[PDB]
Design a protein around this ligand. Sequence first.
Ligand code: TPP
Ligand code: TPP
Ligand code: 3IO
Ligand code: 3IO
Ligand code: MG
Ligand code: MG
Lengths: 536, 536
Amino acid sequence: TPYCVADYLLDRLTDCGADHLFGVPGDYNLQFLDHVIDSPDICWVGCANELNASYAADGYARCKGFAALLTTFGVGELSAMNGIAGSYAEHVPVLHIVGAPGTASQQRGELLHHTLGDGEFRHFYHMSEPITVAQAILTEQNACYEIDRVLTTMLRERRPGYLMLPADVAKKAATPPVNALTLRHAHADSACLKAFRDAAENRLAMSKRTALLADFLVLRHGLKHALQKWVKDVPMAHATMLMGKGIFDERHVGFYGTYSGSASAGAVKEAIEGADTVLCIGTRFTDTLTAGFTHQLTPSQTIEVQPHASRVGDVWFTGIPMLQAIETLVELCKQHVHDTPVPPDGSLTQDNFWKTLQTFIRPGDIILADQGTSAFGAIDLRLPADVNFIVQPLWGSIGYTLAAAFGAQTACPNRRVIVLTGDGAAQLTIQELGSMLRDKQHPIILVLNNEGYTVLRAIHGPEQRYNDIALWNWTQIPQALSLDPQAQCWRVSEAEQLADVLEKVAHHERLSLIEVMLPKADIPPLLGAITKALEA
Amino acid sequence: TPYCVADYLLDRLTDCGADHLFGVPGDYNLQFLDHVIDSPDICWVGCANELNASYAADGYARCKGFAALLTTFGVGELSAMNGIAGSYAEHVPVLHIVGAPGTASQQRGELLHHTLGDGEFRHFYHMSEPITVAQAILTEQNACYEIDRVLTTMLRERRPGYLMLPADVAKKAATPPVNALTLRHAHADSACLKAFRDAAENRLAMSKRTALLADFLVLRHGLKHALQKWVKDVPMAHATMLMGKGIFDERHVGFYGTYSGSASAGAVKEAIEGADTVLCIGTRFTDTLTAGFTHQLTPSQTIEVQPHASRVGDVWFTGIPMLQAIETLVELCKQHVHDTPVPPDGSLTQDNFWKTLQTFIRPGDIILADQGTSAFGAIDLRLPADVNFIVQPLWGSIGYTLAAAFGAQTACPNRRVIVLTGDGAAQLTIQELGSMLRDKQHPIILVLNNEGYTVLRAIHGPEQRYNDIALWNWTQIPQALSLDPQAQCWRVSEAEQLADVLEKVAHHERLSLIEVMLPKADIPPLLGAITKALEA
Ligand SMILES: Cc1ncc(C[n+]2csc(CCOP(=O)(O)OP(=O)(O)O)c2C)c(N)n1
Ligand SMILES: Cc1ncc(C[n+]2csc(CCOP(=O)(O)OP(=O)(O)O)c2C)c(N)n1
Ligand SMILES: O=C(O)C(=O)Cc1c[nH]c2ccccc12
Ligand SMILES: O=C(O)C(=O)Cc1c[nH]c2ccccc12
Ligand SMILES: [Mg+2]
Ligand SMILES: [Mg+2]
C-alpha cells in the first residue's frame, strides 16, 4: 500500500475541511474506496442513491465549509447532477469525485458499461462544466497539481469542483505534502481599495439613517462572525433575506424580521427600505427572496458588497475581496453611523403550527426547510443565537432537505437537527431516512402532510389532480426502512398535541417523525404574498 | 380553450404511440398540464421523483415503442438526466418535455428559481445535447415544425429527444394537423442495396453452416416479428445476447441458450461461434454481454446489420435501412442456407432460485431484471413465447428496474409483470412502489435480499463496508407507502417456500413483494465468468 494519488486526494480533501465522503460505490471506484476505508482522517458514508448523496454533501458543506461526493462513471455522476447544480447555484463547495475506467480502456474506446455505447468517455465531464467552477481529468502526468488547482478554486469561489479519477491513475505513486493546502485570502490593490473606501466614506458621510442587509454569501465565505460583530460595535437596523437567515441573532436589538420585499413585515419594510443608505452584503435578489422582485431598493440608496467586487451608487469597484470591503465598511460605520435602533390553539393550521414551533427552537439548532409551505413559513421564525438555518430557495429542488439533513447531522452529531419537509418533497428522497436510521441519527423530522403540493395548488389549479400525490403512511416509514428503528413517530392534528409531542422529543434521544396534519389550502403569509405578486 | 401549441404537442405525442405522460409538476409547467388533463388521448402519470419518471418512461417505451416525460426547468430535468442518458445508450425513444419560464422572463435574465443565479436559461439545454438525437427550444416562430422535427428524428433513430417549452409559447395559437405524424420508412439507393445483396449472397452461397445472432436493436426498430418469422421459415442455430433476450421463443428448435462469449453454455458456443457464417443483426458487443470481450467472431465469419449500414466481411455498405438489409438476408437465406437444427432444494441459493423461477414464467410475461445477480442470473431463463424481457446492461443503472416496471405495467395493464431487483438496486428508486400502489398495479416483485452489493463483493472487497447497505424491512414497505395497500408480502429462505409462494401469487391478484433471502457470496454462473475475465 504505497502512498499514491488516491491518498494525496484524501489528504488534500481533509485539509479543505471534509471528514466524510458521501456517495455510492461502483466497480470503477472500489479500489479508491479502499483508501477511503483505510484512511484515519476520512469516513466513508454510503448513501441510498447518488442524488441524495449530493444533497447530503451540500448540507454537510453548509455545516463544515466543504464536502465531497464520490460517484461512479456515468450512471453515478449523472444521477448527482441536480445536487451539484444546486450547490453551484447557492455557492456550496462540494467536490465531485467520479471513479472512471482505466485510461487504457478509455483510449481504446471500448464498449464499456455506464457509457453511451459510442466509445466516448468525456461526454459527462463536459456536461458538468456549467455547474462547476473548476474540473480536471486526472492523469499520471498532472494528478497532484490538478487536484490542488481544483480544490483551491473551490475554496476561493465557494462552489463545486469536479475530478475524474481513472482507476489506474488513482494507484500512481505520489508524495505526501509537507504543507497543508490553504488559500490565504488575497488583498486588493491599495489604490483600488482606497478608491472604494473614499467613495464609501463619502456616501456614508451624508447618510442620516443606515441599515444593513446581509445574506447567504457571507455565510459561504465564513463572514458570519464579522457581520455579527459589526452590528454589535455599530448598532443599526439589520435584516437578512430567506437564504441568509441565521447570520444574526434574531432576538437582538435592531432586528425586526426577515426581509422579503413587499411581503416583509411593516416594521421590516421601514427598517430596511426606509433607510436612506442600505448596506447590502452578499445579497442576491431572487424572485422568491423578493416576493416577485417587489423590493424597493435603488442604486443610489445602496452600497453592495459581492465576493470579488463592491459597488457604491452607480460605480463598481472590482478586485476587492469581500472581507476587505467589509472591514473597510466597519471602520466607516464606526466613523459615520450614530443611530440607536430603539425597538396554543386547537386544530392545526399553518398559523398555529409556526407559532408552536417558535417556542420549540433553541440555540444550537440546525433547522432545514424545503421549498413549499415549509420554507415559506419558516421565514417568520425568530431564530435564537447559534442557529444554522439551511434553505435552498434559489435552486429550489424539493427533496433536498431530508437528504441534506442526513449530511448536516453527519457533520454535527452533537447538535439538534430539525427537518421541516412537505409530504410531496419527502417522497423524492425518502430512502435517505434509512441512512439516518442505519447511522443512529436522532433528527426531529416534521412532515407537513397537507396531502399534495400545496404551493402548486395556490399557484394554479387547486383542484387539479396533478397537484395530488400518492398518500403515504408516514409514521410507518421508519419501521420499513430499518430492521430495528429506535424511532418514535406521531401523527398530530391538534396544536396542543403537537406542543406535547415537541416537549417529548426535545432532547432528541431518538429519531422522531412527526406527521403534521394541515389543511390542503392552508397558506403561510409569505406564499400568499408571492401568489399575489404573480398575478400579471 | 382554443387549440394551441400545448395541444399540438399532445396530438403529436399520441401519433407517435404514447397514451401516457410521466413526470413531476412544477410552476413552469402547470398550464401545460391543464391540457394533459383535458386531453382524451393522454393520461397524466405523476411520479414520485423525476429520475423514477424517466425510468418509467423508458420502460413504457420498451412496451409501446415511444414515451414522453415532463419535468420542470432545471431541478426537474437535471434529476432525469441519468434516465435520459440510459435511454440514449440503449436506443429508447423517450421524449423529454421541459416546462420553462416564459420567454420574456428569460430574455431579461431574471434571477428566477431553478436557475444558477446568473440569468442564463440555456445551460441545461446544452447539457442535454450529448444524450439526445434532436432537441429544440420552442418559440412562437418555430413551435410546430420544431416539434415535428424532433419527434421524427426520435422515430428515425429510436433515441430520446428534448423540447424546452416556455409557458408563454405553450399557449400560442396553433392548428390541428390533418395528417398524423408518420415516419414512412426510407429506402436504400437500389444500386447500394444491390451491392450489399451481391456481397452477402456470395458469402452465404459458400456458407456450410449458418447461424443467426440478433440483439436489442431488432427490438427498438420493431423487427422482432421479422426475426421470429425468419428463423421459422429458415431453421438454423440462433441466439441473442442479454440485451436482446426476448426476441426469440427460446423453446423453439435451433435455440440452445443466450450467447455471452466465453461464458456461454458449451452448446451455445458451438451453435453460434462454431458456424462458419454468423448473421449479427442489431448487435453491440459490450463488455457485460461478452463476459469481458471474450467473444470469438471474426470479420470474415460475420455479416453485420446495423440501423443505417451493414457489413459483409471487411466491407461496409452504408445508407441501407436495417429492415431492407434483413429482408435481403431473409430472401438469400431461403435460397442458400441448407440447414436443419434438429435438437426443488432446501436452503435458497442462486442456483435453485433461478431454477424455481424457470417453472413460474409463462407466455405473455413482462420480465425486468436489474444489474446485479438479478440480470446476471436471469440470462439463464428459457423464455417462452411473447415475453418482453427488459434489461439495461449497457447503461447499467441500478434502480432502473423497479421504476421501469411501473412504466411497463402502465403500458400493459393486462399483462403480468415480474420484477427481479436486488436489495441494493431497489433502494435507489423505492418511492415508485408507492406509485404502483396508488395506481392499483399488481406486479410480482422479487427482492433478492443478499444484504448488500454482492456483485461488487464478487468484483472487489467482499468484506469491505462500502459493499454493505442499510438493512430494510422489505415486507413492511407497501404498508408504509400506501394508506391501504392492495398487496401481499412474503419472506422466503427455502426453495420449497418460494415455489409455494409463487404458487399463491400466480394470477397477480394483487401486488406481490417476495423478499428472497440469499447468501452474501452466492453468484450466478455468468458473473463468475465475468469476474474471471476481469483478472487480466
Ligand atoms: C426536484 C423538484 N421537482 C419538482 C419541483 C417543483 N415543486 C416545487 S414546490 C412543489 C410542491 C411542494 O410540495 P410539498 O413538499 O408537499 O409542499 P407544501 O404542500 O407544503 O407546499 C413542487 C412539485 C421542485 N421544486 N424540485
Ligand atoms: C445508479 C448506479 N449507481 C451505482 C451503480 C454501481 N453498481 C452496479 S451493480 C451494484 C450492486 C448491485 O446491488 P444489488 O442490487 O443488491 O444486487 P446484487 O448483486 O446484490 O444481487 C452497484 C452499486 C450502478 N450500476 N448504478
Ligand atoms: O459500479 C458499477 O460500475 C456497476 O454498475 C456494477 C456493474 C453492473 N454491471 C457490471 C458489469 C461488469 C462489471 C461491473 C458491473
Ligand atoms: O414546481 C416548481 O416550479 C417549484 O419548484 C415550486 C416552487 C418553489 N419555490 C417557488 C417559488 C416561486 C414559484 C414556485 C416555487
Ligand atoms: Mg404538501
Ligand atoms: Mg444485493
